[PDB]
Structure 1
Amino acid sequence: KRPTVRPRSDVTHKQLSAFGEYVAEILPKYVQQVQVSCLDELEICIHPDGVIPTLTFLRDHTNAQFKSLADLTAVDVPTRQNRFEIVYNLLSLRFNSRIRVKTYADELTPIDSIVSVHIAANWYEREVWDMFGVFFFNHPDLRRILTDYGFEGHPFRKDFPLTGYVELRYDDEVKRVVAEPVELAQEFRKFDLNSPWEAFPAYRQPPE
């Protein structure tokens, strides 16, 4: 009715809630949380030990048939103990649906790679390792894919600086392309673009 508000269909929410209950009761050993967002997207948060069984079940089940992996990514939230949140978005062409599977890791506990389940996970887990430093067990070839050759540090982490630590320039004395500690002619001006007034009362956290 309202031309400025996105229309909402509740049948997708009901279907995804039913499928979330379905997956949660099928796999109680690994599934830690099931939620359906206001956007009608199903998220299932699992233990890191159950990444292989969860992905295999979602790919090979008759009711799931999530044979297409949309993407594989990581989110760095460095306030929790397992700071890397690994997110698997999957697409079911048989049922025209999309699902999200979440798990956690830190800098020193690797999680199982799903190259045996989906083949795009090869390059996607290479990207995740190169950007965040999350190791993957039983990978065919885990190495850097996006950074420079011999790049030291994982740049998509929150504590990594935006400009980095080294910069490249041509030195004529050695006739090479050499790396220097980074110096900027103009420093990146950080902007404090946060209003001191609360925007969304629905997400008001309780006081500590």
Structure 2
Amino acid sequence: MRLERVLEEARAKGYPIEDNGLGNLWVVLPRERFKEEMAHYKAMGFNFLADIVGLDYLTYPDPRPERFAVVYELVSLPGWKDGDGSRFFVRVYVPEEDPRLPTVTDLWGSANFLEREVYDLFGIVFEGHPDLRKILTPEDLEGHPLRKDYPLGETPTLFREGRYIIPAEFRAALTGKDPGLTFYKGGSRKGYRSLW
């Protein structure tokens, strides 16, 4: 029930409402309204903060507003005091040159680790955090691994007499921007979805 009220509260102020026909909902809040709105979101009854998922869209085929985008996942547990079960995502775009975003540690302690992880994997600093300390990558590692401008750093596979493989030039798989080995891709290899 509270999700419908979220949608009605957001639509009045001009917030885009994203929806796929699969049962997943997005409400994109600007960064100004982000903090206060999500504070209100906790006040609206969001006990549980599932995820903080950061996204780097450098190599995405279509352009996006900003390079980085951080998505928080808000839920209300059905089995607690008054449990509805309404779960949804909030996306907030973060510039390449402005990896700033207020923490919800004060709101949810759940983001204590989660936000740290995104500072490790992305260059995104979450302002007001108790400790933004590199979690996963070694202390002497330079950079942020999950952003697309950071190499995966593969090593060649080894064989008997000088026969070696460099997997990046061995992949028959394509990416979204990879043109393929023929003049073009259309049809199924431009995006494919069955009509149930």
- TM-score over 0.5 (shorter chain): yes
Secondary structure in 1 aligned to 2:55?
Answer: strand
1:156-192 alpha-carbon deviations (Å, 9 max, x no partner): 001111127xxxxxxxxxxxxxxxxxx6454224424
Secondary structure in 2 aligned to 1:32?
Answer: coil
Q: Between Structure 1 and Structure 2, which shows a larger proportion of strand residues?
A: 1
Quickly say closer, same or farther: Cα 1:17–1:96, change in 2 above 3 A: closer
CA distance in 2 between counterparts of 1:85 and 1:75 reads 5
Provide the identity percentage: 29
Secondary structure in 1 aligned to 2:87?
Answer: strand
Q: Which runs of 5 or more structure 1 residues have no equivalent in the other structure?
A: 1-14, 165-182, 203-208
Q: Which residue does 2:10 correspond to in 1?
A: 24
Residue correspondence of structure 1 range 20-99 to structure 2 within 5 A: 20-25=6-11, 28=13, 32-61=15-44, 65-78=45-58, 79-80=63-64, 82-93=66-77, 94-99=83-88
Greater relative CO (CA pairs within 8 A, separation 6+): 2
Calculate the TM-score normalised by the size of structure 1: 0.69
CA distance in 1 between counterparts of 2:128 and 2:173 reads 43
Matched to 1:84, the amino acid is: F
CA distance in 2 between counterparts of 1:42 and 1:23 reads 15
Q: How many residues align?
A: 164
* 2:140 maps to which of 150, 158, 164: 150
Q: Which residue does 2:187 correspond to in 1?
A: 198
Secondary structure in 2 aligned to 1:82?
Answer: coil
CA distance in 2 between counterparts of 1:20 and 1:102 reads 14
CA distance in 2 between counterparts of 1:197 and 1:54 reads 42
- C-alpha RMSD of matched pairs (Å): 2.5
Secondary structure in 2 aligned to 1:145?
Answer: coil
Q: Which residue does 1:174 correspond to in 2?
A: none
